[PDB]
């Protein structure tokens, strides 16, 4: 397993960056982090590894609202409630937030954009290769 105190620092920094996650039980966040660590490399950053991994895990959690409530969630992830209203009490509507235009799935949430810029500044967005002999 990746280093325990580094993982704790990651979850701590993510929590202080987004205060709303303080109420979420820690073990779900632990699982999300240890699942998201499979994507980033180490030697790419080697200084802001905690920052990058927290950003990427946050983007994964907030991708399409995949992270939901524990039991309050109902088994409908394929459907969204655009609007709802009670008769003489209140009413409300909703809608999309980002309206992605490129289909990169990193340019779909602010966290993904932030991590994309971090990666571009630290190493780059390029992959040039040729065959070995």
């Amino acid at each position: 397993i990746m280093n325990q105190e580094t993982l704790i620092a990651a979850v701590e920094q993510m929590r202080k960056l987004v205060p709303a996650l303080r109420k979420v039980p820690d073990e779900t966040l632990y699982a999300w982090v240890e699942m998201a660590e499979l994507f980033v490399c180490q030697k790419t950053f080697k200084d802001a590894y905690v920052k990058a991994i927290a950003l990427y895990a946050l983007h994964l959690a907030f991708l399409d609202g995949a992270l939901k409530g524990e039991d309050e969630d109902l088994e409908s992830y394929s459907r969204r409630v655009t609007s709802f209203s009670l008769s003489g009490e209140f009413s409300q509507t909703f809608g999309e937030v980002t309206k992605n235009q490129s289909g990169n799935m990193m340019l779909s949430t602010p966290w993904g954009k932030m991590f994309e810029q971090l990666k571009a500044r630290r190493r780059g967005r390029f992959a040039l290769m040729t065959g070995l002999r």
Partner: protein, 121 residues
């Protein structure tokens, strides 16, 4: 047709606008009957748990005497069918179901939209 589809949709809708923290109870009294002399008391309560939705509060004024009463309308499920004179206990406050109003196009009504009036006056 397919009233089971209406049933499931109504169940999900009622579950949407409900809070599982309001103590709600339903009281059904029945099977009375007088003595040969002409006086007795029905000893039965039949209180059961229930949950649902409420809307449209209203206050009551009788003659200006400052009694401070209120009445509600409700939305409920199809379990433990509501009768025309049952008691609904809300947050320690008792109401009589003056009207049932089952949302109906078939038997076994999908849901009820009762009208409640506060007990006493």
């Amino acid at each position: 047709m397919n009233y089971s589809q209406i049933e499931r949709m109504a169940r999900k809708g009622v579950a949407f606008f409900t809070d599982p923290s309001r103590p709600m109870n339903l009281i059904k009294q029945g099977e009375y009957g007088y003595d040969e002399n002409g006086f007795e008391i029905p000893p039965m309560e039949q209180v059961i748990p229930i949950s649902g939705a409420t809307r449209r509060p209203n206050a009551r004024e009788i003659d200006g005497e400052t009694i401070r009463a209120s009445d509600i309308l409700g939305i409920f499920n199809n379990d433990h069918e509501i009768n025309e004179g049952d008691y609904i206990e809300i947050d320690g406050i008792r109401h009589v179901v003056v009207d049932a109003r089952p949302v109906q196009a078939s038997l076994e009504p999908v849901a009820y939209r009762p009208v409640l009036r506060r007990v006493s006056v």
